Amino acid sequence: AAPQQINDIVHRTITPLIEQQKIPGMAVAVIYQGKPYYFTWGYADIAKKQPVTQQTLFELGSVSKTFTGVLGGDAIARGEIKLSDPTTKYWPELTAKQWNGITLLHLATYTAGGLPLQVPDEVKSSSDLLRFYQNWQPAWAPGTQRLYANSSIGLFGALAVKPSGLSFEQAMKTRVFQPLKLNHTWINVPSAEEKNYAWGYREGKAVHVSPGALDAEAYGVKSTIEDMARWVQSNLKPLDINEKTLQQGIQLAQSRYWQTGDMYQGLGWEMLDWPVNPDIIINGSDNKIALAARPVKPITPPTPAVRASWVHKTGATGGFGSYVAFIPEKELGIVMLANKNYPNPARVAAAWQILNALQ
């Protein structure tokens, strides 16, 4: 059981959300005074009447970028990479002149100059990727415009693990998932766990995310509400993490590297100063803003992680919609996982209503 104030605000907020958005299945975790409280609704598989449980796996979509950012932070802390390193240090075959000056920082923070939102579906092998990046022409100089992009942070993640000699998946398992005891968090769902993998629903049809280049880095993690609550706990309170470079990596992913308007770009995470204007976060989450190019101001050196922040990330796939938000100063956070991609502003409005009530 949760304290009644949590049960009350969750029931009053999530029930109309599910009805308004026709969400088939949903799981919510509230982290309150550092402890998790879980809630589930509806079905992971409608036709087969499988309820959502605390072991249901949801596609995180772009919430996966938070894991990629932390894994990159850990590689920085290990001394394996620097954000100022040129992309070409890790991929010297990227000889085209437009890559001169594009650093790992730019890739990690969507500031390379207009790398596109998606890797094209036609681009599948490393050779296809090389052609893609060699032929890409920037719209802007590096470090001037943020354009949210799977092709940008996806490449960051692929390159950041090269010194380790591990694949991206193996690095993520060994360096992030295992130390944090995320035992039900997967880039590739094992056969024995397929029974727990919810279907996503798009226009009423059951769907799962399709393979794509750099999927693991940009949008490919699947996880349970329990593991996601532990992920929030770890990012709320990194000083409890025993593995020093992972603790440091978590901290570095909440450093502020760029500002645009009132939002700050971390590694995967995005941040605003708390208290927030809820309209700014709600309206800023709409893709009309969130996917637009926005001019950035550099923060030199990056601001070390600010405890009084709203730290958050939206994520989607064709069939799923996820959101995570937390406030380190308040020891408070929320995870919302659903098997329908419903509008971002409705996610953020509900999260803020719940966390604002519990602050």
d(CA 106, CA 153): 9
DSSP one-letter string for 325-356:
EEEGGGTEEEEEEESB---HHHHHHHHHHHHH
Question: Which residues, in sequence order, are CB contacts of 358 under 8 Å at separation 6+?
Answer: 5, 6, 9, 30, 32, 332
CA neighbor of 66 nearest in space, from 157, 127, 141, 198: 157
Token readout for 66 is 């938070």
d(CA 142, CA 105): 10
Q: Amino acid identity, residue 156? A: F
Residue 301 preceded by cis peptide, ω within 30: yes
62 is catalytic: yes
For residue 110, report the phi and psi dihedrals to the nearest 5 degrees. 70, 25
Tally of CB atoms within 10 A around 132: 18
Question: Residue 251, CB half-sphere, CA atoms under 13 Å: how many?
Answer: 14
d(CA 231, CA 10): 20
Asked if 319 and 199 count as a contact pair (C-beta separation under 8 A), the reply is yes
How far apart, in Å, are the Cα atoms of 239 and each of 67, 128, 160, 257, 262?
18, 42, 24, 21, 27
**H/E run at residue 98:** none
Token readout for 329 is 């100063």
d(CA 125, CA 122): 9
Asked if 325 and 310 count as a contact pair (C-beta separation under 8 A), the reply is yes
Q: How far apart are the first and last CA of the chain?
A: 19
- CATH superfamily assigned to domain 1-359: DD-peptidase/beta-lactamase superfamily (3.40.710.10)
Residue 275 preceded by cis peptide, ω within 30: yes
CA-based torsion, 144, 146, 152, 154: positive or negative: positive
How far apart, in Å, are the Cα atoms of 195 and each of 53, 130, 192?
12, 37, 7
CA-based torsion, 39, 53, 26, 24: positive or negative: negative
Tally of CB atoms within 10 A around 129: 21
d(CA 198, CA 247): 31
CA neighbor of 332 nearest in space, from 307, 358, 353: 358
CA neighbor of 58 nearest in space, from 344, 267, 324: 324
Token readout for 186 is 């997967």
CA neighbor of 184 nearest in space, from 46, 60, 50, 44: 60
d(CA 12, CA 336): 15
Asked if 214 and 119 count as a contact pair (C-beta separation under 8 A), the reply is yes
Token readout for 235 is 């990012």
**H/E run at residue 269:** none
DSSP code, position 307: S
d(CA 194, CA 207): 14
Q: In a 3-state reduction of DSSP, which class is residue 260?
A: strand
d(CA 246, CA 226): 20
d(CA 303, CA 87): 23
**H/E run at residue 247:** helix 244-253
CA neighbor of 143 nearest in space, from 198, 96, 185, 104: 104
d(CA 116, CA 134): 13
Asked if 221 and 185 count as a contact pair (C-beta separation under 8 A), the reply is yes
Token readout for 124 is 């599948």
Q: In a 3-state reduction of DSSP, which class is residue 288?
A: helix
Q: In a 3-state reduction of DSSP, which class is residue 316?
A: strand
d(CA 189, CA 196): 9
| 3-class secondary structure per residue, 120-168 | CCCCCCHHHHHHHHHHCCCCCCCCCEECCCHHHHHHHHHHHCCCCCCCH
Q: In a 3-state reduction of DSSP, which class is residue 203?
A: coil
| Domain locations in the chain as residue ranges | 1-359
Asked if 31 and 232 count as a contact pair (C-beta separation under 8 A), the reply is yes
Of the listed 62, 234, 309, 322, which one is catalytic? 62
Token readout for 59 is 């596609």
Question: Which residues, in sequence order, are CB contacts of 264 under 8 Å at separation 6+?
Answer: 256, 257, 258, 270, 271, 272, 299, 303, 309
Token readout for 262 is 């009132």
d(CA 32, CA 17): 21
CA-based torsion, 58, 60, 64, 70: positive or negative: negative
Name the H helices within 40-85: 64-77
How far apart, in Å, are the Cα atoms of 267 and each of 65, 215, 252, 356?
8, 17, 7, 25
